[PDB]
Amino acid sequence: YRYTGKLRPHYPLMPTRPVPSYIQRPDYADHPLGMSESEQALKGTSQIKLLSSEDIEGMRLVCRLAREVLDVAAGMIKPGVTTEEIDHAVHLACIARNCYPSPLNYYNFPKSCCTSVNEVICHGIPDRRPLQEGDIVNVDITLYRNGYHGDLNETFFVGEVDDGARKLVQTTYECLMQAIDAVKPGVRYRELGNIIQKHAQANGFSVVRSYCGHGIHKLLHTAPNVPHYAKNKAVGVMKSGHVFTIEPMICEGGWQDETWPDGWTAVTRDGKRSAQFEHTLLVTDTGCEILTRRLDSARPHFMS
Ligand SMILES: CO[C@@H]1C(=O)CC[C@@](C)(O)[C@@]1(O)[C@@]1(C)O[C@@H]1CC=C(C)C
Ligand SMILES: [Co+2]
Ligand SMILES: [Co+2]
Ligand SMILES: [Co+2]
Ligand code: NA
């Protein structure tokens, strides 16, 4: 394998972390290849679930607990801390809230969150690498509670970063919020990519094509598919009671991605940095509820 940048994996990983049996487990948790029977049963559908009031309560709960856990991770971002150490804390924070860490054994994913540094786009595997001053790192939290998943991510700065890093992360957050600000009944899912790419391109950045926002509720991902680039072919129209994520991945260089031999770590093919932010959204009559919002601050952590 030819690495695209400076980052490398830092192995071995610590033994897989157990989740006590009193925590309710998704179906894939105990599948030997981490496949989800419930996902495979709905695989190939484009029907978008309209959530019941029960579903809404379930999504509000798991999304706010997910936020609490991301906030735990945010409080640990400093030079010297390893991404494995963040994952350990995230794992304990999930259990402390009677939640299962959704990534764990998802298609045999080995950890309890995704930690994406610099040229990593998404799905980085927590490992023994200490964060370095100047790094950008995204922590992506997915939790599972009472049958529902919730999903959010932020990119953080590690100590002082360069101006490129500041501009990339700010622009990405702006992309996310502009997209969110357009969500309401009657808008085509395909429109959000036009808004995101417009802002990205205006700032000299590109938009990752191979990963998308997604429906989420009783499945970790389902319809709709929500691409972040312009003139995409996404199917479907927003309606009150839809829940989905928006999670733009923006890049300093070109948009092309490739995957490490681990089968998960997605990286820019050119080795330049990529940043991401993500919320889980519930469409309402007036617009949307941001289920994963920060409750104790108007702003994401990088703005501190
Ligand atoms: C729609 O896919 C999703 C996508 O494109 C955006 C990035 C991911 C990670 O959310 C995604 O790739 C998922 C859901 O397949 C990945 C499996 C999830 C975990 C936490 C390992
Ligand atoms: Co996510
Ligand atoms: Co997501
Ligand atoms: Co899947
Ligand atoms: Na990155």
From Swiss-Prot:
Example of a GO MF term: aminopeptidase activity
GO biological process, one term: platelet aggregation
EC number: 3.4.11.18
Annotated Gene Ontology cellular component terms: cytoplasm; cytosol; cytosolic ribosome
Enzyme class: hydrolase
Residues engaged in binding Zn(2+) 3: 140, 151, 278
Textual note on the cofactor: Binds 2 divalent metal cations per subunit. Has a high-affinity and a low affinity metal-binding site. The true nature of the physiological cofactor is under debate. The enzyme is active with zinc, cobalt, manganese or divalent iron ions. Has high activity with zinc; zinc cofactor is transferred into the active site region by the ZNG1 zinc chaperone.
Catalytic activity: Release of N-terminal amino acids, preferentially methionine, from peptides and arylamides
Locations listed in the record: Cytoplasm
Superkingdom of origin: Eukaryota
Binding site for a protein: 123, 221
Keywords recorded for this protein, A-Z: Acetylation, Aminopeptidase, Cytoplasm, Hydrolase, Metal-binding, Protease, Zinc, Zinc-finger
Keyword Metal-binding: yes
Subunit structure and binding partners: Associates with the 60S ribosomal subunit of the 80S translational complex.
Name of the molecule in the record: Methionine aminopeptidase 1
